[PDB]
Amino acid sequence: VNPTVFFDIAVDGEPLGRVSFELFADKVPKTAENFRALSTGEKGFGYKGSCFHRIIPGFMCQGGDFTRHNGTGGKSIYGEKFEDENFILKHTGPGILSMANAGPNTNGSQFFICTAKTEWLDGKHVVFGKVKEGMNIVEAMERFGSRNGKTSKKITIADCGQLE
Ligand SMILES: CCOC(=O)CNC(=O)NCc1ccc(N)cc1
């Protein structure tokens, strides 16, 4: 029974809506657990109040850099970084949740949500969940991002946690 987690998104402090995700703990357990734990904040840190630093319309929404807020940071529940667990699952379309990284076996906390099929990232980024509800809210986030990823307003995870 795969976990469900939610993000409540704010544009410049003002509520936008809720995105929920199924985490594929059945296929990517170690990676699902890191995201589930960081969403609930139960280990004393996580996504709550963190930034979506890079939004590229037609491509993806990236965030989860809760230590440097700009794409150069983050940390896992297992230490600063952890392995690519496997590459069983693929970037099949919009809504796919996948780990960002800075090379092989460099996963921390940064993740991205796909707004298109991104097949080329297969074997390179670990897919561990997908958007369950509120894809329309990820599409609304998309509209504050730019060609180079810089957001026009501050997009944040106002609140996050587990639903199931
Ligand atoms: C479509 C996803 O595009 C990327 O992942 C581009 N990489 C990227 O921003 N890397 C910065 C980074 C630094 C440290 C950790 N732990 C994770 C990521």
Numbering used by the authors: 2 to 165
Which sentences from the paper describe this structure?
Cyclophilins are peptidyl-prolyl cis/trans isomerases (PPIase) that catalyse the interconversion of the two energetically preferred conformers (cis and trans) of the planar peptide bond preceding an internal proline residue. CypD is localized in the matrix of the mitochondria and acts as a key regulator of the opening of the mitochondrial permeability transition pore (mPTP), which plays a major role in calcium efflux from mitochondria to the cytosol and can lead to mitochondrial swelling and cell death. Cyclophilins adopt an eight-stranded anti-parallel P-barrel structure. Their PPIase catalytic groove is formed by a mixture of hydrophobic, aromatic and polar residues, including Arg55, Phe60, Met61, Gln63, Asn102, Phe113, Trp121, Leu122 and His126. The existence of a deep pocket contiguous to the canonical catalytic site, called the ‘gatekeeper' pocket, has been revealed.
Superimposition of fragments 6 and 13 with the known structures of CsA and SfA, two cyclophilin inhibitors, suggested that a urea moiety could be used as a linker between the two fragments, because of one hydrogen bond with Gln63 and two with Asn102. Compound 22, consisting of fragments 6 and 13 connected by a urea moiety, was thus generated. Compound 22 maintained the key interactions of fragments 6 and 13 within their respective pockets, while making one, one and two additional hydrogen bonds with Arg55, Gln63 and Asn102, respectively. Compound 22 also potently inhibited CypA and CypB (IC50s: 13.1±5.9 and 6.1±3.8 μM, respectively). As ester functions are often associated with low biological stability, the first step was to replace the ester function of compound 22, which makes a key hydrogen bond with Arg55, without affecting the cyclophilin inhibitory potency. All designed compounds lacking the ester function lost their interaction with Arg55, resulting in a drastic decrease of cyclophilin inhibition (IC50 >500 μM).
